[PDB]
C-alpha cells in the first residue's frame, strides 16, 4: 500500500518501557500503527557505515566481540543497536525514495546526529541519517537532498559529513547561546566550505531562556528561514533528524524550550510540501515519555494526512520574542549573500503568523 512507512525493531531495546517502546505503544493504542505499513529492519553493513565513518571506527563499534545495564556490556549492546538503527533508517529511506511508500517515520535508537567520522559522542555511535543520504547519493544518484534537524542540539556530525557538498542542504534549528550549549558547534556563520558554501544553514537561537523559545518562535523561523531557502533549493527527498527535546517538559540543560508536541505536526506538514512529499523522519533526542509520544503521534498523524488539531489562537497571534527575532535576522543577513529569497526584502520576523498572513 502506498502510504506512511514505519520502522521499528525490538533488538534495539536495552533490556534483552523506554523511549522507543513507549512511542511504538502510543502509535498502536491511537490506531495510527494500523494505518501505516510497518517494514522489517536490518543491521547496516560495514561498507554502508563507512560512507560516513572510518574503517577503524566502524570495525571497533560495528563488530561483535563474541545483559546487566549497569555494566560495560550495556554500551557494547547500544553500539550494536546503533548498527541496527542505521539499517532500519536506510531501509525506510529507500522504500520512500523508490516510491514503494509515500513517506515515513523511523522509531530508532540510539540517536545519530552527534556521531563524527571517527568519534562517537552524545550517545551517538553511527550517524544513521547521514549514512542514508550518502547511500541515496551513491546508489540512486539523487541530485538534491534536504536534511532538516530540529533536535534542540546542533547536529555536528551531519554538518561535518556534508560541509563541502552543495548537493545536500543541511538546515539545523538549535539552541546555541553563543557557543555555550552542547555540543558547542553550529554558529550562524558556519555556512559551508569550498563548493558547498551557502548550503549549510544554522538557525541558531541565542539569548538564553529569557524567555524560552516556543511555538511562535519556531513557526516564525520556518516562515522566514527554513521554507524560503528549502523551497528555492527544491530538494528531491527530505530527511529529518526529528529530536523532540525542544518540547516543554525537558529541563534547562537537557532542553529548556517550551514547544508543544502539536507544533511538530505543523512543521512536518510544511515539510511535506517539498520533494513531492518524499519525506522520512528519524527519531533523535527527547526523553520525556509523554512529550516524545505526543510529538511522535502528531508527526505520524501529519504524514498520514489526518486533520491536525488547530494550534491555540494565542500561538497564532503571538509575536516572536526579541531574542528569537534577533537570532532569525542575524541568520537571514548572513544567508542573503547566497539565496535570492533573502535578497529581495526587509525583515518581517517580528510579526505573528496571523499578521504575516494578513499582510500578504
Ligand atoms: O546535552 C547533552 C546531550 C547529548 C545528547 C543529546 C541529544 O541530542 O538529545 C541526543 F543525542 F541524545 F539525541 S543532548 N549532554 C550534556 C549534558 N549531559 C549530562 C549531564 C551531566 C550532568 C549534569 C547535566 C547533564 C550527561 N550527559 C550529557 C550529554
Ligand atoms: K538541531
Ligand atoms: K552542505
Ligand atoms: Zn538533543
Curated annotation (Swiss-Prot):
<comment type="similarity">
    <text>Belongs to the histone deacetylase family. HD type 2 subfamily.</text>
</comment>
<feature type="active site">
    <location>
        <position position="114"/>
    </location>
</feature>
<protein>
    <recommendedName>
        <fullName>Histone deacetylase 4</fullName>
    </recommendedName>
</protein>
<comment type="subunit">
    <text>Homodimer. Homodimerization via its N-terminal domain. Interacts with MEF2A. Interacts with MEF2C and MEF2D. Interacts with AHRR. Interacts with NR2C1. Interacts with HDAC7. Interacts with a 14-3-3 chaperone proteins in a phosphorylation dependent manner. Interacts with 14-3-3 protein YWHAB. Interacts with BTBD14B. Interacts with KDM5B. Interacts with MYOCD. Interacts with MORC2. Interacts (via PxLPxI/L motif) with ANKRA2 (via ankyrin repeats). Interacts with CUL7 (as part of the 3M complex); negatively regulated by ANKRA2. Interacts with EP300 in the presence of TFAP2C.</text>
</comment>
<comment type="function">
    <text>Responsible for the deacetylation of lysine residues on the N-terminal part of the core histones (H2A, H2B, H3 and H4). Histone deacetylation gives a tag for epigenetic repression and plays an important role in transcriptional regulation, cell cycle progression and developmental events. Histone deacetylases act via the formation of large multiprotein complexes. Involved in muscle maturation via its interaction with the myocyte enhancer factors such as MEF2A, MEF2C and MEF2D. Involved in the MTA1-mediated epigenetic regulation of ESR1 expression in breast cancer.</text>
</comment>
<feature type="region of interest" description="Histone deacetylase">
    <location>
        <begin position="5"/>
        <end position="360"/>
    </location>
</feature>
Amino acid at each position: 500500500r502506498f502510504t506512511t512507512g514505519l520502522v521499528y525493531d525490538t533488538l534495539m531495546l536495552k533490556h534483552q518501557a523506554g523511549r522507543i517502546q513507549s512511542i511504538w505503544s502510543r502509535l498502536q493504542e491511537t490506531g495510527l500503527r494500523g494505518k501505516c505499513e510497518a517494514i522489517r529492519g536490518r543491521k547496516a553493513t560495514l561498507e554502508e557505515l563507512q560512507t560516513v565513518h572510518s574503517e577503524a571506527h566502524t570495525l571497533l563499534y560495528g563488530t561483535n566481540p563474541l545483559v546487566d545495564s549497569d555494566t560495560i556490556w550495556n554500551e557494547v549492546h547500544s553500539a550494536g543497536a546503533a548498527r541496527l538503527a542505521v539499517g532500519c533508517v536506510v531501509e525506510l529511506v529507500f522504500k520512500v525514495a523508490t516510491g514503494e511508500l509515500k513517506n515515513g517515520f523511523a522509531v530508532v535508537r540510539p540517536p545519530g546526529h552527534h556521531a563524527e567520522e571517527s568519534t562517537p559522542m552524545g550517545f551517538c555511535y553511527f550517524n544513521s541519517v547521514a549514512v542514508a543520504a550518502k547511500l541515496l547519493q551513491q546508489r540512486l544518484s539523487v541530485s538534491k537532498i534536504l536534511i532538516v534537524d530540529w533536535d534542540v542540539h546542533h547536529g555536528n556530525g551531519t554538518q561535518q559529513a556534508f560541509y563541502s557538498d552543495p548537493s545536500v542542504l543541511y538546515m539545523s534549528l538549535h539552541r546555541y547561546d553563543d557557543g555555550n550549549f552542547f555540543p558547542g558547534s553550529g554558529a550562524p556563520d558556519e555556512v559551508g566550505t569550498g563548493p558547498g558554501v551557502g548550503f549549510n544553514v544554522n538557525m541558531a537561537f541565542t539569548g538564553g531562556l529569557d524567555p524560552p523559545m516556543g511555538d511562535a518562535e519556531y513557526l516564525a523561523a520556518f516562515r522566514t528561514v527554513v521554507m524560503p531557502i528549502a523551497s528555492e533549493f527544491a530538494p528531491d527527498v527530505v530527511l529529518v533528524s526529528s529530536g523532540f527535546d525542544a518540547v516543554e517538559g525537558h529541563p534547562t540543560p537537557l532542553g529548556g524550550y517550551n514547544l508543544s508536541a502539536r507544533c511538530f505536526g505543523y512543521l512536518t506538514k510544511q515539510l511535506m510540501g517539498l520533494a513531492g512529499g518524499r519525506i522520512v523522519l528519524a527519531l533523535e533526542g527527547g526523553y520525556d515519555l509523554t512529550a516524545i509520544c505526543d510529538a511522535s503521534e502528531a508527526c505520524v498523524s501529519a504524514l498520514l494526512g489526518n486533520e491536525l488539531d488547530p494550534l491555540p489562537e494565542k500561538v497564532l497571534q503571538q509575536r516572536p520574542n526579541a531574542n528569537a527575532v534577533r537570532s532569525m535576522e542575524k541568520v537571514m543577513e548572513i544567508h542573503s549573500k547566497y539565496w535570492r529569497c533573502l535578497q529581495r526584502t526587509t525583515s518581517t520576523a517580528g510579526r505573528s503568523l496571523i499578521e504575516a498572513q494578513t499582510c500578504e
